[PDB]
Design a protein around this ligand. Structure first.
Ligand code: SF4
Lengths: 106, 434
């Protein structure tokens, strides 16, 4: 803390730009529209993504909650709870466990 | 189809009808689920296990020694059913592990079925070479085999067959220096033979299932096989058969005694909650209502029962009529089927709509913690040892088998004679006990 708010906004903008650049990393490799069109490499990446998201699905089923929707960019989770803080800490614990299952995933 | 056991590494290329396709899929799903439940309940080697699973096979006609009947239908059924389960199960690592466990149980049992005379030609048909040694070789090398053998007590080299194997096939076996080696060839007893073959078979199945997982997106474009192949194992009842349209004579007053004598723990506690509260949430209300529909209660009896219970609920009877009587009549009558026309199956009760605060539906074994399970079991007066294996089974996530054991304990019997999947089946069997 104790930083100029303008520089804070600059840092936020840079972080968001890094986020979108990362998200588009896979974009630059899989498209016939791209220079580096790699059908097998893109297929392998998509297969791994589907596998990991689906694994998260069954195991979050194991941890006694229920999932209702997700396609590689978001996961809908029902809670069966009415305490917002309890729901938030449930999300925190599932985030921590999935982070220790897969190291670099955020 | 040259022999009964067979290793599944050549997919079929025939043409079959959709009805036969679904029949094979459902039958083999039932067989594997029965194998899972029986292996959980019993020890894998007991004659009770062997005979019960033999009877399961006979009623599902999946394997038998070669004859006129065996050649055409059963082994072909096994083949296509196993491959369609490959398509169904290659989706996830967890499902692959589950499938591997049950198929190893199945294959070990089948190998135990095969008589010793035919195992030679089975290994020959298996296309991977193994040479059995002669009696003279066995007698000559008995001392070497016993000296280099594992902790098997004594010098006794009994009737168990000994084979000759390339050393590279038994790496983990010989690398512990627990076997004799002769010119790069090993000599091994039957238990380790079957262990080696099952490890190789699990390796090949792992690779093949991974490859089929790579092949799923192309083969799922069909519309008549997607809704099945998504859910052969996940959410399909193994012919629960407690379908709507049953008959029976039920007295309305007797509902309390029938609940305390013949209801599975979930439904028993749901009925007690109804009696002590005169009100239920949507899930429990619908669950118990359609259960009472299934058990044989008629429409007028059900309507009068619910109206009488809401008399103690303190809402207006005409409000009851307008609000609910429509819903109960719809559940007893017209379409909306598979959700209101049917009695709930146990696998559905466990996998759908977990209860929340203020809810009492859902199988308690899966939807309540072990301390509250213990409190409920104490309230139902079961022996502490019985409660102990109940909690052990709960730790093993075999909720249906736990409910089974609760059934025998509450009925003071040894074996219920089936594997429960439907609360209406539970109630029907309890009435069969009279
Ligand atoms: S196993 Fe099925 S019948 Fe038994 S308590 Fe659970 S949901 Fe009810």
């Amino acid at each position: 803390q104790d930083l100029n708010p303008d520089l804070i906004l600059q840092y936020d903008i840079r972080q968001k730009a890094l986020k979108l650049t990362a998200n588009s990393m896979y974009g630059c490799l899989g498209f016939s529209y791209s220079r580096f069109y790699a059908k097998p490499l893109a297929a392998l990446v998509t297969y791994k993504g589907r596998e990991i998201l689906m694994h998260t699905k069954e195991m979050v089923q194991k941890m006694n909650l229920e999932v209702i929707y997700g396609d590689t960019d978001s996961i809908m989770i029902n809670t069966n709870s009415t305490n917002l803080e309890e729901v938030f800490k449930l999300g925190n614990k599932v985030k921590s466990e999935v982070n220790k299952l897969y190291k670099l995933l955020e | 189809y040259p022999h009964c056991l067979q290793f599944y590494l050549q997919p079929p290329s025939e043409n079959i009808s959709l009805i036969e396709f679904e029949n094979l899929a459902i039958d083999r799903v039932k067989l594997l689920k029965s194998v899972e439940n029986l292996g959980v309940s019993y020890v894998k080697g007991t004659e009770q296990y062997q005979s019960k699973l033999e009877s399961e096979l006979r009623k599902l006609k999946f394997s038998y020694r070669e004859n006129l009947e065996d050649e055409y239908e059963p082994r072909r059924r096994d083949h296509i059913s196993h491959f369609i389960l490959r398509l169904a199960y290659c989706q996830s690592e967890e499902l692959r592990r589950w499938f591997i466990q049950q198929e190893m149980d199945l294959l070990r049992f089948r190998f135990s079925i095969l008589p010793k005379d035919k195992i030679q030609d089975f290994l020959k048909d298996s296309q991977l070479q193994f040479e059995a040694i002669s009696d003279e070789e066995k007698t000559l090398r008995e001392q070497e085999i016993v000296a280099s053998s594992p902790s098997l007590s004594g010098l006794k080299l009994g009737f168990e067959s000994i084979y000759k194997i390339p050393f590279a096939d038994a790496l983990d076996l010989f690398r512990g220096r627990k076997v004799y080696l002769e010119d790069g060839f090993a000599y091994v007893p039957l238990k380790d033979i079957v262990a080696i073959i099952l490890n190789e078979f699990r390796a090949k199945l792992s690779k093949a299932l991974a490859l089929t997982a790579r092949s799923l997106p192309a083969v799922q474009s069909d519309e008549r096989l997607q809704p099945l192949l998504n859910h052969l194992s996940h959410s399909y009842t193994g012919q629960d058969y407690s379908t709507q349209g049953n008959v029976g004579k039920i007295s309305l007053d007797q509902i309390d005694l029938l609940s305390t004598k013949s209801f599975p723990p979930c439904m028993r506690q749901l009925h007690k909650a109804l009696r002590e509260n005169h009100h239920l949430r949507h899930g429990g209300r619908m669950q118990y209502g359609l259960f009472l529909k299934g058990i044989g209660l008629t429409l007028e009896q059900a309507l009068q029962f619910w109206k009488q219970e809401f008399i103690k609920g303190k809402m207006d009877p005409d409000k009851f009529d307008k609000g609910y009587s429509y819903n109960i009549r719809h559940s007893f009558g017209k379409e909306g089927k598979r959700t209101d026309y049917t009695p709930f199956s146990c696998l559905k009760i466990i996998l759908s709509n977990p209860p929340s605060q203020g809810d009492y539906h859902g199988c308690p074994f899966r939807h309540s913690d072990p301390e509250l399970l213990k409190q409920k079991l104490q309230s139902y007066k079961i022996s502490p040892g019985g409660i102990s294996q109940i909690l052990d089974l709960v730790k093993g996530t075999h909720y249906q088998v736990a409910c089974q054991k609760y059934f025998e304990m509450i009925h003071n019997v040894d074996d219920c004679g089936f594997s429960l999947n439907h609360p209406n089946q539970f109630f029907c069997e309890s009435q069969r006990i009279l």
